[PDB]
Amino acid sequence: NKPIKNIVIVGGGTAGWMAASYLVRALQQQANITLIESAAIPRIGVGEATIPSLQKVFFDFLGIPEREWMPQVNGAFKAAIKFVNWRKSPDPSRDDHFYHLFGNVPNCDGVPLTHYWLRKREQGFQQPMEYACYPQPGALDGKLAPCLSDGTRQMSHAWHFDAHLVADFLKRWAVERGVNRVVDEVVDVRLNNRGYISNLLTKEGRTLEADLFIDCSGMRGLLINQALKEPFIDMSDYLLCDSAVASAVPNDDARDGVEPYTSSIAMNSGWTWKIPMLGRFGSGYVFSSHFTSRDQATADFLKLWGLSDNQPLNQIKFRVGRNKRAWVNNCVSIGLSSCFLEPLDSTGIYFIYAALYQLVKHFPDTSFDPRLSDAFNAEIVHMFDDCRDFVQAHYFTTSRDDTPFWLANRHDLRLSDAIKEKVQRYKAGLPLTTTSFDDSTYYETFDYEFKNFWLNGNYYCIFAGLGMLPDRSLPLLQHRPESIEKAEAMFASIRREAERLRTSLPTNYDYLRSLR
Amino acid sequence: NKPIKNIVIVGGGTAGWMAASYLVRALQQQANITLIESAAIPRIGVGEATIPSLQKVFFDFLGIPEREWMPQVNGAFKAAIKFVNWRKSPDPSRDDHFYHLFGNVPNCDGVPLTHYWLRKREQGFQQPMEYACYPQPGALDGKLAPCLSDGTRQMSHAWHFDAHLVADFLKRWAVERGVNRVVDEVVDVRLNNRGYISNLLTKEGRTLEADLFIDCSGMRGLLINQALKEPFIDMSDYLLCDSAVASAVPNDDARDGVEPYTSSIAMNSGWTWKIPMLGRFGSGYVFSSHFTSRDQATADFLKLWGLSDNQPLNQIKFRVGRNKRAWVNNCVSIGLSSCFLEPLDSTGIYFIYAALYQLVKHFPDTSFDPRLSDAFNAEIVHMFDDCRDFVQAHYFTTSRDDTPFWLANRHDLRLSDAIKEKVQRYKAGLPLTTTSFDDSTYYETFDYEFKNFWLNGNYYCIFAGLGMLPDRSLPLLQHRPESIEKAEAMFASIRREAERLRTSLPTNYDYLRSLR
Ligand SMILES: Cc1cc2nc3c(=O)[nH]c(=O)nc-3n(C[C@H](O)[C@H](O)[C@H](O)COP(=O)(O)OP(=O)(O)OC[C@H]3O[C@@H](n4cnc5c(N)ncnc54)[C@H](O)[C@@H]3O)c2cc1C
Ligand SMILES: Cc1cc2nc3c(=O)[nH]c(=O)nc-3n(C[C@H](O)[C@H](O)[C@H](O)COP(=O)(O)OP(=O)(O)OC[C@H]3O[C@@H](n4cnc5c(N)ncnc54)[C@H](O)[C@@H]3O)c2cc1C
Ligand SMILES: N[C@@H](Cc1c[nH]c2ccccc12)C(=O)O
Ligand SMILES: N[C@@H](Cc1c[nH]c2ccccc12)C(=O)O
Ligand SMILES: [Cl-]
Ligand SMILES: [Cl-]
Ligand SMILES: [Cl-]
Ligand SMILES: [Cl-]
């Protein structure tokens, strides 16, 4: 069979230029690649927080180190997501916060530290789980960098960046390596009688043909949904939010510092993101229109940050779910045309490069063997649905009952069999999936991370954070007193490292300025 | 809740003494353990070939290195299973053999070598897959040891040993660390009204009580099947054999050497194992009674080895399948009381220590939380059924059509959805699950190996061995000429290592004698 020669990508958002870059790199330029993007249709404007596989799976693949891309996109550091006012009905006299951290919780004689922490917690021990089991949370409270001043990394971290700058950076990289950029707008899609895309008609009269079409057209799904008619599985029975009101907000970095993490601040009818970088943070109130109007959500958002009635806003609506199939006939959807999940977990951009990695693993010839797309499709379903379930677990575990929105989350959601089973095992005292690798190995073995994406420590962070603990510590530990004492030694080490980091890390602000 | 204090194990076979040892070790002797075994009921008499996790998961756990246990059980080395006369209707003018090897096939730029081999095979390249992709197969032909003379390991390997000696060795180890050995026979089992085992009545009038009962009673499943009435899922719709005729056969080691592997020699109505060790090999014709009588199978077995009409034999029958649930109420089945699969894959003893590892991971208190047993049960189902499918794939992939037995295997088996899907992906040219770890790391990370037990290289060995190849090499490789050339370099390295091993390894015979 003839190989794939001609590739057309529709869409010039983050997905489009990620796809163009990744395929320029993977197909050894043995490919004619054309990207078409409409001047009249703006990018979504958001997507600024990431996870550590962005470097390993995406940028390393292109041969671009952090030090090269970061300065060009207003890059900053992310060590965690901090959840504020999620656990209980909010009380301004109380500090309700917890971290969801990158990296893995150590094991002690085959048992995670989370489990030794719980046994202590049964006996009255008061310190929060993540402050016991990880050395960096206090450093994040102190707004400290993830590295020493000389660049040496001291904790696992990912990135914050400007959405527009990242796409433009990738545009320049791909165009310079022979991607053909067309500024025009696809107006019609022509299918043959067998249902494969034959060509695209544009607004300015071009007819585009290709062997492979990549749909990066955003939520409209021009090729995958509109032309090929693939069902979208709406999942508003699983998750309630459907809208966001978004803006960039100036920050007094010299007075206030730069938080080395994303915040998730729970609201009356959804939650607000905060994404610090030098000079400014991106922020957005993710909300449900069934519980609050866009007008009210806009008022709540402005009030939170003390913004003015004159401040222009990025008003977004969205549908939660994914296509029944990501790849149909000669068309692979990537990005918002494929699926969507609110950014509680910062996995939107992860879905782009994870799908691109998987497309290359299942790469077709011009005969489009359906066994390759079937196998690809099944990897996407598992990837999405597991993340969907992990996001939903924040919502059904909360104890908030102060509004109709939080009540509905407590009582009215549809839960998968898979999530119920995981919750069941947790409540019994069982660790969920654990790794014996260190952070570096885990963040370097994508076929492992891909299938083992959510680990014991991820679930513990969220569940213990929201104040839902197992019925019982692990029965085995009543037979293992020496292991319990060895775990105390490990808790003492973590505490020493926490103290060292306190007096050794530069502030995130100063470090960022030093980079530039 | 009160912890598990008293443990009774029924059964003094390999399972019983593995269980007793493993629990003596895991529960820090904070446990009263009693094993009961009947003098009138013999052990099964077989189970002599193993896989590399025997050392890592089992013996290392007990703190017993190879050099300690091997000499006491007539230990020998196993580097592979060699399949003879499996591929085609047998012709004594033809050499029909292939190896299924331990360890992992290297990757080249994210693609397994198996896939670069196939692309060469499309262009007419004649060398067999495993001789291209692994450095040891020729060494195994030459009956060479897996180590240099000074002990340095040169290939991944496992063990052969005497079944009776291993159990007796473990008996001495467990008894010396405070296991109470009772020679008596359980005649009745008493259940309360809620259905939990209350006590055992013995032939000599003892009443045994415990918090936890381990059923190692062999195929009868005295506690799990006979008392608790748990269904056995018979799987004779998946796999046809139901019997074996077995013996030990003297070997002229000085004239003939000692094969560093297990052989699987396909017969008219099943297949024969060969398990070499110093002085002798264990052998057994696994057969289906629907296709041949035990009398005929006995004649075929004797004829194969030139044995005498006076040679006494271990005549076995068995049922293929597993319990619906391995752990019910206060009783965990381990060994032949749990499940059975013919030794095509040498996983019977693997099932013992894998279940023991999983029991300790899900260890109960005296309240027997059903969520712990449910989660344990589900790990056992996945473990067994995946192995069942892997075994069945040898049978439905063969081209033999010379007997009713081989025809039935070609046409008449029930296949799981899971195996069909794997076969589908294979035929498309896709690698099945791959690892980026080396052999050592993989054989040291049990939570990884447990879930990722059968890898691309395992399936390739069997499928390519039987002469079923994919429709097509991987389309991606037509875009990657530099990777193809880099893979040629890797093929050249393997070939150099093969030559080095040829002139460097001692024979298996000599090495074994040198150990003693
Ligand atoms: C509210 C919200 C918050 C989010 N937060 C995060 C986050 O914190 N972290 C994270 O990783 N991700 C986040 N995401 C996801 C992230 O924004 C996206 O994954 C990413 O920006 C990719 O967008 P896209 O290219 O698929 O779509 P878009 O940005 O919508 O781009 C669509 C492109 O297709 C073009 N196009 C459409 N139709 C045509 C046509 N007819 N002819 C020619 N061109 C056409 C458009 O002009 C545009 O160029 C968030 C998403 C939303 C909605
Ligand atoms: C034909 C065949 C080939 C095999 N080949 C391999 C192989 O190559 N590699 C491999 O790893 N595995 C192999 N196996 C599996 C292996 O033999 C077993 O996994 C292992 O030996 C464990 O046996 P067991 O203890 O469960 O049962 P058994 O050996 O049957 O022991 C049963 C024990 O329970 C006792 N008992 C029963 N009832 C009572 C009672 N009423 N009161 C007191 N005591 C009682 C018996 O006396 C005996 O001590 C093979 C199995 C078979 C059948
Ligand atoms: N495997 C992911 C898990 C993850 C996804 N989103 C997260 C947000 C916060 C912490 C961890 C995550 C990682 O560590 O990158
Ligand atoms: N993960 C197993 C796979 C396996 C089971 N039985 C085998 C027999 C031969 C070769 C490999 C195997 C191992 O390498 O140990
Ligand atoms: Cl996101
Ligand atoms: Cl973890
Ligand atoms: Cl076996
Ligand atoms: Cl492999």
PDB file of all heavy atoms in Angstrom, chain B residues 270-284:
ATOM      1  N   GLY B 270      -2.365 -34.225  21.920  1.00  0.00           N
ATOM      2  CA  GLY B 270      -1.861 -33.373  23.009  1.00  0.00           C
ATOM      3  C   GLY B 270      -0.379 -33.091  22.803  1.00  0.00           C
ATOM      4  O   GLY B 270       0.086 -32.995  21.671  1.00  0.00           O
ATOM      5  N   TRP B 271       0.376 -32.967  23.887  1.00  0.00           N
ATOM      6  CA  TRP B 271       1.799 -32.648  23.789  1.00  0.00           C
ATOM      7  C   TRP B 271       2.563 -33.198  24.995  1.00  0.00           C
ATOM      8  O   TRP B 271       1.972 -33.392  26.060  1.00  0.00           O
ATOM      9  CB  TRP B 271       2.002 -31.134  23.681  1.00  0.00           C
ATOM     10  CG  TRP B 271       1.527 -30.411  24.900  1.00  0.00           C
ATOM     11  CD1 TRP B 271       0.239 -30.058  25.198  1.00  0.00           C
ATOM     12  CD2 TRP B 271       2.325 -29.967  26.003  1.00  0.00           C
ATOM     13  NE1 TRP B 271       0.181 -29.431  26.404  1.00  0.00           N
ATOM     14  CE2 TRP B 271       1.444 -29.353  26.931  1.00  0.00           C
ATOM     15  CE3 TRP B 271       3.699 -30.027  26.304  1.00  0.00           C
ATOM     16  CZ2 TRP B 271       1.889 -28.793  28.130  1.00  0.00           C
ATOM     17  CZ3 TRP B 271       4.139 -29.457  27.497  1.00  0.00           C
ATOM     18  CH2 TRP B 271       3.236 -28.852  28.393  1.00  0.00           C
ATOM     19  N   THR B 272       3.869 -33.430  24.825  1.00  0.00           N
ATOM     20  CA  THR B 272       4.716 -34.012  25.874  1.00  0.00           C
ATOM     21  C   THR B 272       5.736 -33.008  26.426  1.00  0.00           C
ATOM     22  O   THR B 272       6.459 -32.363  25.659  1.00  0.00           O
ATOM     23  CB  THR B 272       5.460 -35.302  25.366  1.00  0.00           C
ATOM     24  OG1 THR B 272       4.505 -36.316  25.037  1.00  0.00           O
ATOM     25  CG2 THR B 272       6.436 -35.854  26.412  1.00  0.00           C
ATOM     26  N   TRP B 273       5.797 -32.873  27.745  1.00  0.00           N
ATOM     27  CA  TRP B 273       6.838 -32.032  28.357  1.00  0.00           C
ATOM     28  C   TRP B 273       8.123 -32.805  28.595  1.00  0.00           C
ATOM     29  O   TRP B 273       8.100 -34.040  28.739  1.00  0.00           O
ATOM     30  CB  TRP B 273       6.379 -31.320  29.649  1.00  0.00           C
ATOM     31  CG  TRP B 273       6.328 -32.126  30.939  1.00  0.00           C
ATOM     32  CD1 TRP B 273       7.380 -32.480  31.734  1.00  0.00           C
ATOM     33  CD2 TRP B 273       5.137 -32.612  31.605  1.00  0.00           C
ATOM     34  NE1 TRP B 273       6.927 -33.191  32.844  1.00  0.00           N
ATOM     35  CE2 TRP B 273       5.556 -33.278  32.787  1.00  0.00           C
ATOM     36  CE3 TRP B 273       3.759 -32.544  31.312  1.00  0.00           C
ATOM     37  CZ2 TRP B 273       4.645 -33.857  33.689  1.00  0.00           C
ATOM     38  CZ3 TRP B 273       2.851 -33.153  32.188  1.00  0.00           C
ATOM     39  CH2 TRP B 273       3.303 -33.801  33.366  1.00  0.00           C
ATOM     40  N   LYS B 274       9.243 -32.076  28.559  1.00  0.00           N
ATOM     41  CA  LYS B 274      10.538 -32.624  28.917  1.00  0.00           C
ATOM     42  C   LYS B 274      11.208 -31.590  29.820  1.00  0.00           C
ATOM     43  O   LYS B 274      11.293 -30.423  29.446  1.00  0.00           O
ATOM     44  CB  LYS B 274      11.382 -32.882  27.661  1.00  0.00           C
ATOM     45  CG  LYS B 274      12.720 -33.588  27.969  1.00  0.00           C
ATOM     46  CD  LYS B 274      13.620 -33.682  26.757  1.00  0.00           C
ATOM     47  CE  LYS B 274      14.917 -34.373  27.088  1.00  0.00           C
ATOM     48  NZ  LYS B 274      15.805 -34.356  25.876  1.00  0.00           N
ATOM     49  N   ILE B 275      11.638 -32.007  31.017  1.00  0.00           N
ATOM     50  CA  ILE B 275      12.184 -31.072  32.039  1.00  0.00           C
ATOM     51  C   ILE B 275      13.516 -31.605  32.541  1.00  0.00           C
ATOM     52  O   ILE B 275      13.558 -32.333  33.532  1.00  0.00           O
ATOM     53  CB  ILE B 275      11.187 -30.810  33.247  1.00  0.00           C
ATOM     54  CG1 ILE B 275       9.978 -29.992  32.784  1.00  0.00           C
ATOM     55  CG2 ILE B 275      11.908 -30.127  34.430  1.00  0.00           C
ATOM     56  CD1 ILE B 275       8.814 -30.000  33.726  1.00  0.00           C
ATOM     57  N   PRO B 276      14.615 -31.284  31.824  1.00  0.00           N
ATOM     58  CA  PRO B 276      15.936 -31.789  32.211  1.00  0.00           C
ATOM     59  C   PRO B 276      16.504 -31.227  33.513  1.00  0.00           C
ATOM     60  O   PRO B 276      16.410 -30.020  33.800  1.00  0.00           O
ATOM     61  CB  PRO B 276      16.827 -31.383  31.024  1.00  0.00           C
ATOM     62  CG  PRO B 276      15.873 -31.157  29.916  1.00  0.00           C
ATOM     63  CD  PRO B 276      14.695 -30.519  30.571  1.00  0.00           C
ATOM     64  N   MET B 277      17.117 -32.117  34.278  1.00  0.00           N
ATOM     65  CA  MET B 277      17.953 -31.730  35.411  1.00  0.00           C
ATOM     66  C   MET B 277      19.082 -32.742  35.474  1.00  0.00           C
ATOM     67  O   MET B 277      19.126 -33.634  34.639  1.00  0.00           O
ATOM     68  CB  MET B 277      17.140 -31.621  36.726  1.00  0.00           C
ATOM     69  CG  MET B 277      16.252 -32.795  37.118  1.00  0.00           C
ATOM     70  SD  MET B 277      14.855 -32.158  38.113  1.00  0.00           S
ATOM     71  CE  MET B 277      13.484 -32.522  37.015  1.00  0.00           C
ATOM     72  N   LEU B 278      20.014 -32.601  36.414  1.00  0.00           N
ATOM     73  CA  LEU B 278      21.123 -33.570  36.494  1.00  0.00           C
ATOM     74  C   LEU B 278      20.607 -34.993  36.703  1.00  0.00           C
ATOM     75  O   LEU B 278      19.788 -35.222  37.588  1.00  0.00           O
ATOM     76  CB  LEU B 278      22.149 -33.209  37.579  1.00  0.00           C
ATOM     77  CG  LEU B 278      23.326 -32.289  37.229  1.00  0.00           C
ATOM     78  CD1 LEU B 278      24.275 -32.224  38.439  1.00  0.00           C
ATOM     79  CD2 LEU B 278      24.101 -32.757  35.977  1.00  0.00           C
ATOM     80  N   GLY B 279      21.060 -35.906  35.840  1.00  0.00           N
ATOM     81  CA  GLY B 279      20.766 -37.342  35.930  1.00  0.00           C
ATOM     82  C   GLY B 279      19.502 -37.860  35.254  1.00  0.00           C
ATOM     83  O   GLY B 279      19.414 -39.034  34.920  1.00  0.00           O
ATOM     84  N   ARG B 280      18.534 -36.984  35.023  1.00  0.00           N
ATOM     85  CA  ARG B 280      17.183 -37.419  34.712  1.00  0.00           C
ATOM     86  C   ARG B 280      16.412 -36.224  34.150  1.00  0.00           C
ATOM     87  O   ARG B 280      16.801 -35.093  34.408  1.00  0.00           O
ATOM     88  CB  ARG B 280      16.559 -37.950  36.016  1.00  0.00           C
ATOM     89  CG  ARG B 280      15.092 -37.681  36.242  1.00  0.00           C
ATOM     90  CD  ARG B 280      14.792 -36.557  37.246  1.00  0.00           C
ATOM     91  NE  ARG B 280      13.364 -36.231  37.152  1.00  0.00           N
ATOM     92  CZ  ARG B 280      12.591 -35.700  38.105  1.00  0.00           C
ATOM     93  NH1 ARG B 280      13.068 -35.388  39.313  1.00  0.00           N
ATOM     94  NH2 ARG B 280      11.304 -35.499  37.833  1.00  0.00           N
ATOM     95  N   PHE B 281      15.369 -36.475  33.353  1.00  0.00           N
ATOM     96  CA  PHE B 281      14.319 -35.480  33.076  1.00  0.00           C
ATOM     97  C   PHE B 281      12.921 -35.981  33.455  1.00  0.00           C
ATOM     98  O   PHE B 281      12.634 -37.171  33.306  1.00  0.00           O
ATOM     99  CB  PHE B 281      14.313 -35.028  31.610  1.00  0.00           C
ATOM    100  CG  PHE B 281      14.173 -36.154  30.601  1.00  0.00           C
ATOM    101  CD1 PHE B 281      12.928 -36.474  30.059  1.00  0.00           C
ATOM    102  CD2 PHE B 281      15.308 -36.866  30.158  1.00  0.00           C
ATOM    103  CE1 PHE B 281      12.800 -37.503  29.107  1.00  0.00           C
ATOM    104  CE2 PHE B 281      15.197 -37.895  29.213  1.00  0.00           C
ATOM    105  CZ  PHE B 281      13.940 -38.207  28.675  1.00  0.00           C
ATOM    106  N   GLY B 282      12.091 -35.067  33.974  1.00  0.00           N
ATOM    107  CA  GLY B 282      10.649 -35.276  34.159  1.00  0.00           C
ATOM    108  C   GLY B 282       9.951 -35.118  32.819  1.00  0.00           C
ATOM    109  O   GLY B 282      10.289 -34.235  32.041  1.00  0.00           O
ATOM    110  N   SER B 283       8.997 -35.989  32.523  1.00  0.00           N
ATOM    111  CA  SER B 283       8.313 -35.942  31.233  1.00  0.00           C
ATOM    112  C   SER B 283       6.864 -36.353  31.429  1.00  0.00           C
ATOM    113  O   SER B 283       6.529 -37.055  32.383  1.00  0.00           O
ATOM    114  CB  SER B 283       9.025 -36.834  30.188  1.00  0.00           C
ATOM    115  OG  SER B 283       8.471 -36.691  28.892  1.00  0.00           O
ATOM    116  N   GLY B 284       5.989 -35.893  30.547  1.00  0.00           N
ATOM    117  CA  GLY B 284       4.579 -36.158  30.715  1.00  0.00           C
ATOM    118  C   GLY B 284       3.880 -35.811  29.432  1.00  0.00           C
ATOM    119  O   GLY B 284       4.147 -34.767  28.847  1.00  0.00           O
TER     120      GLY B 284
END
